[model samples]
Target chain A: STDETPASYNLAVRRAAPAVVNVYNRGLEIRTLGSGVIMDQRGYIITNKHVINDADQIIVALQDGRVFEALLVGSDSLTDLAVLKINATGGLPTIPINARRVPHIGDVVLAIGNPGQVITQGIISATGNFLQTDASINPGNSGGALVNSLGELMGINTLSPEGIGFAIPFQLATKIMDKLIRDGRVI
Target chain B: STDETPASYNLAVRRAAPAVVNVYNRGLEIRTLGSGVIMDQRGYIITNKHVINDADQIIVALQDGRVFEALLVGSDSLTDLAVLKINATGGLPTIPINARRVPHIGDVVLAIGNPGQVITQGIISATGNFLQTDASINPGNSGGALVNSLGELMGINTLSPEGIGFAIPFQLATKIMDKLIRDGRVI
Candidate 1:
């Protein structure tokens, strides 16, 4: 046995954190509009509707310091979710997903966001239409990806209010992303 | 790299979580006053001053289901930290401490709370003023232990405001605790 205590989720950080991007306005400096998750190599991203509902323009900033002009694909008011398209000609870092696993209450989670390597940790407090967590989510931190200890994408952060935070479960977020890509909106 | 993935902070929880307790008034009913951390085997506990400042009487419920009638040792409004002393005959769980470990920004931390042993996770967002973390600190959560992945005590959970949370660094919290215990007040 090793004498040192094994303590860290660095693997998770390395695996999925890079895919967590920040949504900025036209300038990419005035202030962070919100956050987003890189869903696949296609460069289609998932974020919150309220964040890009009527913004002047949208930008995506990856952890690797790469920036791009993102196009607003579509948004859904019901889930407060939206999709963005960026034409990154090559492979893009994407969040790992495990749709088969059901998120259980008490499972650990980390919120990867835009400000620096802003990652807040918490447990799945409840599971329902929305996965509720006690993970701290700061202002302009929505549309971020909530990743589990395994670095698997669990949910998409939506709000932080009353000391409680909520995220759209990953399975649902994926479902919405597919719809927006297919029909340009959720029907 | 090892074949198995080391992807859990369960060791930390097992090491330090038992020390986190709930602060209640009188009959341990109605509503929780706040949270607390057992500091030593001598039965000295640390918590927030505001929680017991106007209480009729103070009660403590341990994570292991042990309840104790605590005596208020002292309180310092400057730090909002209070010490409670209990009389337990046998071994008592205490938070792990590493005075030498300097907390760096981006280090993972878990905020243990009063509700159902609620534990929120996040990283050290900044240093100085206070150990500002993104770790969600819920209402009635002050005085809880902010522990690292090694299960070492890092700070005392204090407040959550505007999506940001703050804790009194363990060194400072320890210094205050020492003064309160020696002089019955911070001199």
Candidate 2:
């Protein structure tokens, strides 16, 4: 039987995709796809550590098929998160992640990103300090979007799904993001 | 000194009292008062498992002074929580403890109900998965209410007060309750 049409998956992807981007680092010339939410039109973006690590140059690809180079402001080693800045191109389409508590069980979620360099989807398996999910994540999928059915960014996919995955909570993300905007680094 | 006059105490008691309930265990006719919130009115109650352990019978006493017998469907010993139920007490009062991750330090809280068999109020000395209070809880007070400044039932007063008391998180409690109602117990 066909799986019931996922109402939440569709909503989360549509609302959150604009904020998601594929990051390509130049120095190492490594290219990976991760998800980020635009914090401002000034070019602030958020993603995971592995997605930006060892890259001398960074590029951000938006959902509208437009690509632009980005600058790494700073990151937190402990949380494996980093912030980047791109020249504000038109109105920044940032998706706001609910900074409140993790969504409840049975909460519809969408795993949005260029999984294997192609769009893919998944729902939230669980939440808290440790987020467990069956959502498929691959090598290039690090730093992608884990948005709830409501289209709020619940987490940034940090690692390949290996039985358990973790996300820097939105509160933590916001704090680091603030520091990035202020001091230009999480140090 | 008169303590009840404080605005903080009033708010704490008012918001949390309704979510606090008298818990009873089946077969033992054991009556212990603790705090819990109704996650769903279709008939699911969440509290500390310790409150229902010795219970051969389980029941709950509401804020309205109405005491209804409940059944212990399931519990989690790790979290020290139990899910009990009565006939669908739809529209019964419940506290929204899911609004925040956890109570912050120095945030005012009230421990309501039969502390030493006398309804009492106390500030949250500290909080985590559980809560700490200087207010005394008698043996009968296990599973009582730990109300936040908003008077929300943040947790169930499980451990008796010694140097400090503690309460289980409402999210854990609600999970246990849901499991109880569905599977008759949390495996």
Candidate 3:
């Protein structure tokens, strides 16, 4: 009976995939790729600070194949998070942020990114203000969205170890993002 | 707004606390303290193999202040799990084990330990068959119960890092315990 059931995380991936974009950072010496999430309809994006560090130019490619040069809004190295803005005329779709409920251990989560949206399924490992997951997060997955079953943004995928990864919790990231929007940096 | 809301984990903690016990191991040259969970009413207890390793005497203290010298039934080092038997006149209570459901990311969980039942709240950080939590698990927390919001035992707290911790998933631990009871060791 168990074999007959089809495992599905597609619904969650589809809902959050649109908001996730490929981030390309070009420098004189090298070019790097990462991921990002649309936080505001006005083209405001959130990504890992390390993803955009020392980039001479940053470009964001949407799921629909549209591309735009992005402007650095603000960044906080302490939290390893950064925000950028792009000029999308019709506004962008945003992944809903889960603010009311706290994440639990072993809750099914998906890491949405631009490397074709990796469907690595894993549970929340721990939450001590920040979030951690066993889902495989690679180089380009940094600055992506760690979403829940409801397709809500729970955290930003940041760092990874050999068999584990960590995320910046939405609760903490929201506060920092808000400050970044208002003051352009976390003070 | 926060104070008005009663803490939710209290009920879960109460449900599992009765099954947790303080484990004291006395060896020829050393003594150690750990924790354990009652797996059967027949006085079968489950704990970490390291907890009872090389101990000349093993003691179990229940939440009701009842203490008993435990008999080492069997142990498996690979899984780091051990089984013990205590001669309780009355049947012992057991924390519900969750074997069917897979732990998820962001699932709310509570860790129940013997040292006055240290109730640490956290979300499942990762699950690669084994579980990881950000809950502050002290030394005595080893072999304790990692219970979910439903008051079900999902994992056994095994080891920890500076701000992180690992747990043997119930799925794996249960199998090893069964083997230990039947075969005395994994053959």
lDDT of 1 by residue, A1-187 (tens): 1234435555677788888898888743455688889999989999888888767778889878899989989988899899999997687999999878888889988877775656677789889579998887654467888888899988999863376789988988888889888888766
Q: Which candidate number has the best DockQ?
A: 1
| Candidate 2 local lDDT, B39-68, one digit each (tens) | 556667776676666766566767587778
Query: How well is each residue in A1-187 modelled by candidate 3, as lDDT tens digits?
Result: 7669675777777778888998887676536568999987878899988888877899888888788899999999888999998887786778777567666655567887775556565656555446766666777678899887777777899873234578888888888888998888776
- Candidate ranking under DockQ, highest first, comes to 1, 3, 2
In candidate 1 the C-alpha lDDT for residue A132 amounts to 90
Selected candidate, larger lDDT, 1 vs 3: 1
lDDT over C-alpha atoms for residue B62 of model 2: 75
Q: What digit string (tens of lDDT, one per residue) describes model 3 on residues B1-187?
A: 1122212455576678789898987676535578999987888899988888867899889988788999998998877889999996766778887667878977877776665544565778988457888764556577999988888988899863366778888888888888888879776
DockQ of 1: 0.17
Q: After superposition, how far is residue A78 of candidate 3 from its true place, in Å?
A: 1.9
C-alpha lDDT of residue A25 in model 2 = 65
Interface RMSD of each: 4.5, 18.9, 9.1
TM-score of 1: 0.59
RMSD of 2: 16.6
Q: Write the per-residue lDDT of candidate 2 for residues A1-187, one digit (tens) a residue.
A: 3877642345555677777777776663455545565666778888877777777778887778787888888887777788998898678778655554444422334566663334444333344564534355555556776666567766676763122344555666778788877886556
Q: Is the docking of candidate 2 incorrect, acceptable, medium or high quality?
A: incorrect
| DockQ of the candidate models in sequence | 0.17, 0.02, 0.10
